[model samples]
Target: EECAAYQCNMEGCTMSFSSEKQLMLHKRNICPIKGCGKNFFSHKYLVQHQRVHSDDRPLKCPWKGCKMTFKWAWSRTEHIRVHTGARPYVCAEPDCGQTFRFVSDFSRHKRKTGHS
Candidate 1:
């Protein structure tokens, strides 16, 4: 009777859905633990947030000689910028010509400079 097979793979979770979109919506708006109203973008994003509560870092920095580990893939990409010195976040002011290593910090620079 189901249109698609979408199931939660987490242990003790029996949540299943008839469509991939349905499963994604459920995971984003519902909590597996019940009675919790937290939301997430995806199951893995929810799991990554749970890892913060559980201190479970499943992904590690792949760069050699660095032992840093992260609970999210996004964190690993951000961490890689440290070694590469990649300044992805730039100031809005062309005359100022300032750059930041992080979009996280660039947000502050924007606020400090009031560019936007």
Candidate 2:
């Protein structure tokens, strides 16, 4: 016999905990890739998903005389100074004495000196 809406239909199992919420979670958790059960919450997660299809380390940085490899070029430049004695970016000035590890920093120093 048919039971009430609040009653369980099969095996007397109950689903009192927000049926809409459960359905929403299920739909949101389904992965776009076939046979891929993983769920991405945002676009960044989608980018990571594409990475699985392509081994693209697009944010890799290469620094000379340094075994330091970073995901971002800026990070690599900042890190190279730890290995190289080249203070090309930031100088020992009163404004900003931060050490730079790239030509851009050296250029900044030149500009700052010229301005002074």
Candidate 3:
């Protein structure tokens, strides 16, 4: 097997990649915030994650009569479903018509019911 030449130098990080480009891509997304070492695959995603450390909530729901705000764009995106009455999470168990607006709720239901 070929040896991985591109190795991460960050403290406690043991990741290694096959190509320099792959390592560069990984390094590009490392969080710059102090004491926050989280990394994402894209710059946009990294920026979104940074909001959590900074407590920056710039995204807001545009639906009529809704004033909900969120730090991540995806949160605001999912919140839109509330206004539209969308339930995208459906139970897989037979004859169980349970649905959910959020994945956390759906996941909890799955664990509680022991659904595979």
The prediction achieving the highest TM-score against the true structure is 1
Best by lDDT: 3
Candidate 3 wrong stretches, greater than 4 Å = 1-55
After superposition, the stretches of candidate 1 with alpha carbons farther than 4 Å from their true spots are 1-53
In the range 3-53, model 3's lDDT, one tens digit per residue, is 747786655555566778766765788775657778787666765675567
lDDT of 1 by residue, 1-116 (tens): 44467886666565676677767666564544445567876566665554444667889898899999987898899999999989987776768778788787888877777674
Candidate 1 pairs with clashing backbones: none
lDDT of each: 0.72, 0.51, 0.77
Each model's total of backbone clashes? 0, 3, 0
Please, what are the lDDT tens digits per residue for candidate 2 over residues 16-107?
A: 22354443443453333446667767535543563465443345345555454455567666666666676654464577556656766677
TM-score of each: 0.54, 0.30, 0.51
User: How many backbone overlaps does candidate 3 show?
Assistant: 0
lDDT of 2 at 91: 60
lDDT for predicted candidate 2 compared with the true structure: 0.51
From the highest lDDT down, the ranking of the candidates is 3, 1, 2
Candidate 2 clashing pairs?
88-106, 89-105, 90-100
All predictions: root-mean-square deviation over Cα?
8.5, 15.8, 11.0
